[model samples]
Target: MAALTRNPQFQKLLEWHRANSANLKLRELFEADPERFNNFSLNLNTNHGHILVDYSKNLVSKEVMQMLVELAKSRGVEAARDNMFSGSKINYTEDRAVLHVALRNRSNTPIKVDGKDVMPEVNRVLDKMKSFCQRVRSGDWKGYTGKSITDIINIGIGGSDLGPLMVTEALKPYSKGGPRVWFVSNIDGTHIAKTLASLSPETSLFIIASKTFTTQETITNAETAKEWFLEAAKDPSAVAKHFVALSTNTAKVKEFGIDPQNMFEFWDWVGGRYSLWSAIGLSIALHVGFDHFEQLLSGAHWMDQHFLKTPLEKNAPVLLALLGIWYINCYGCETHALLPYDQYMHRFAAYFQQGDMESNGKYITKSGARVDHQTGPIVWGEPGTNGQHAFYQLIHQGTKMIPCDFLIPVQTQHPIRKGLHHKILLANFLAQTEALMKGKLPEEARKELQAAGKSPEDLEKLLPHKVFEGNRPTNSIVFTKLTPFILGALIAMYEHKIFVQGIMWDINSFDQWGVELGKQLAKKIEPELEGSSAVTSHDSSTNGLISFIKQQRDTKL
Candidate 1:
């Protein structure tokens, strides 16, 4: 593999984009091609739902798409895809296989690493979660007060927190009789304090999620959590009844008063960002029941097969990755907007902030050279109606070329108002993408103004402000419903898309060394924070901030 710019395929793509993109209006493209939707759209038929991915509205034409696919092929994306699935140590920095796919390998196929099949181990943890979920859900796993658990708290930071938090929120409807789940990730006392405010120690269960059982935030929070429970029970043995773990450190877990049997294990291959499918999903299972959790796995597995076997030309993830590269590199798009119409999926964009940024945010390459091209985009968005009011103004009239993804579920979980609410929601969902694609012309705006009986002078004055420049790009994804399974499918699709983009960027997506330097500095700063003393151990900026904080703490001023 060479630098992306060196590729003739990439150069030609740039050539096409430079010569034609300015005039490639979406409305004109649709008008010229009657079967544009059929040409670009792909359907994913799963047992739980039907999903229609209509990418026809994107700024790319068939020629551009063909060029993008060719570039991906030249980048050896297919071989990279095969290598990861077969358990090669593709995560070169960490010396581990990126095998989050194995956690959801429902077919039970032997995906081996070092000639050892990992399916058994993956199933082992999954089976472990199954019984634990049943015991808690069935009220057999009693608290120290001899009451069935009602509240489950997950304490972890970064990937440990985001995946489970997002999944639990996304699949909340599937949680039938499961306990109320709460998450405390921030080391700030307020996070744990507020979470515990409503939870009783008699019925509160805590799942501490740290691989080594020594993540600073999680361990500190867990220590406080234990003290809170001890305050009520007045006995140390009670900690075992209400506390379990999703970690590997048996010694540390045991020392913290959790029984070794209560710990669910995952491997080093399970990156924190992708660990929701692993035992890190203990919260998801405990909240949504193990059966529904398995349904999620099954859905991911279905998409996994699709990504593995499908040709690059027809592959959903591949197409998505290419489109993203088109925007990031060609359009120079700095950010991607993910607008989910369903309210339950409001956290969807927030979750990917970590998933995409941490995974593909690298500037250095596998060859130990600086990349000559862009790597990742800033992922940001909100749910449908809210974003329309806030940012649609910028997206409609702003100068930046933004590529957005619009997702909606045709079947709403709570279809109130005899479906009037959903119908209106659908109208907005349909309208936004269509508007972005086929934006208003000056004549169109002028006609709108005249129809409202505006004076000629007023109409002339407001015409430019009202006109929306046509040819903004978007991808519209419609789901039959937002079941646990479909949510899983959607998550896996994006995961693979991120993976393909990382491949094209020639960066190891698994490592997050970017955040390591800050932790090292924070450790040194913590010891200096004990007393109100001026410390000049580092740069003036750092010392000044430290002294200012200490001085502020001295008098609460």
Candidate 2:
């Protein structure tokens, strides 16, 4: 661990630390140093497009950045990275290589898992997906009674639900005039209740997405949909026609009444959150078709190669992770805000809520020793402009030091018509970051107040509360457009960024066994909700939630 401090970059930071800390309150710092704004921002331009990431006014000095880079390097970040790309079993717990990258391998090179080249199987599934998508998008794939299938329901939880749903919402415009997609993940009857109300069994298809065929939420929803199908068609045979599976458990999928022919397999190596490039995204393909789906994959592939080859100092994902680590560990910050400016990205917050919290929310390191410090910060956010109107108050003036990430696209899928809405939207995004970095000082505030005819007493009374503490850390991520390709790249960017943070923290990024306890307890108590004699071994919170839900069901609607 001492080697981590040996790099010249790390030494420079420690030396600088004695004289200065990145402690300038954003407002005071902005007033104190005029060139601070230009000193802290960065840009990346590739042949594909330009990515402008403004991390200025963050609580980190140049030395801090260099040391964070060194820390990653001292851990052999490059070697671990190459091991992942070379198909080593980096996910040591499952004894599997964390190779979600292989799912989007544009080179068509062979990627082996368990001594078996999985590329041939991946391509075969891709081909199957393309054929299915082509038929569906072209209106050749019809439901019973020869009606073009218009509604697609994806029934899966965790990765099945989050990954595909996140991509679908991200690539909303790319969806062809093929089918409307719906998702049902939670076992709450209300989830599927409203979903089932909108559809005729004849025109809807269900995609059961679970790597394991036996995921309770997914299988329960699948069974409910099958029962709903029988209600309309009066035939169990419709199950074979309307449902598809994205699972390696072929026998169980067949036994569950889906045709074995419709089963698409994903390996254990491809964890759920990162499984979008695999068969889990068949819903995306069906809605958008092969070409755009491939663009999404290609975009992620580009980021994957970048992550593999980029030096730690210049690496975007690595830098982002360190930025997160610096705030969480160094500054003792507890929460990270993600505010995306696009309205379509409403679900993105919930997606990351699970993605980040589930991945690194650990108290123990990989060596099975208790960690001495915090692992993951509380990750939360809403889309910006909306967040501005709602939570930006607490962010700008609240007591807590909340770090934020802001994502904005140069173009909106929903454009303003003869209005200033788009301009206002973009302006607010730019202004918020600037404001976060260079907040108004009391002197500046007093000057403005005096110009507005306010007395000194009035100015002084409100100044402390109204002062913007601009040195709050924020990363402004900007893309050229919100196309499928850009959306893919953006998701991949964060996916790997979170992965890098996990590697640095010495935790298993791929496994989410932490998410299972509550889910397992839910299954045990579910029968009791229906007044069955089901015995449960559960803690107070799980039992409390279950009892409350049951009581609500009995008395409420």
Candidate No. with top lDDT: 1
Compared with the true structure, what per-residue lDDT tens digits does model 1 show for residues 152-222? Answer: 99999987899899999988888889999999999999999999999999999999998778889999999
* Residue pairs with clashing backbones, model 2: 26-471
RMSD of each: 1.4, 3.2
Instruction: State the displacement of the C-alpha of residue 97, model 2, in Å, after optimal TM-score superposition.
Output: 1.5
Give a tens-digit lDDT track for model 2, residues 1-557.
32323345445555565556655455665666777656665576655666676776577766677788877876667887888877889887778888889899989788777688878888899999998887777778777677878899999998889878877888888775758999999989999999999998888999999988898778889899998898888877767668889997888988898887888888888888778899999998887778999998988888888788777777878888888877776667899888999877888888888778887887666676666666778889988788888888888788888889999888778776853777898999989888877777788887788888877788778777666756766888888877887777777888888888777777777776666787776666656667633324567776677667766665755
Question: Which portions of model 1 miss their true places by more than 4 Å?
Answer: none
Judge candidate 1 at residue 498 and give its lDDT. Answer: 97
TM-score of each: 0.98, 0.91
Q: Cα lDDT for residue 537, model 2? A: 56
After superposition, the stretches of candidate 2 with alpha carbons farther than 4 Å from their true spots are 1-19, 22-42, 455-457, 527-557
- Residue 416 shift from truth in candidate 2, angstroms: 2.5
For residue 142, model 2's alpha carbon misses the true position, in angstroms, by 2.0
lDDT of 1: 0.91
Q: Name the lDDT of candidate 2.
A: 0.80
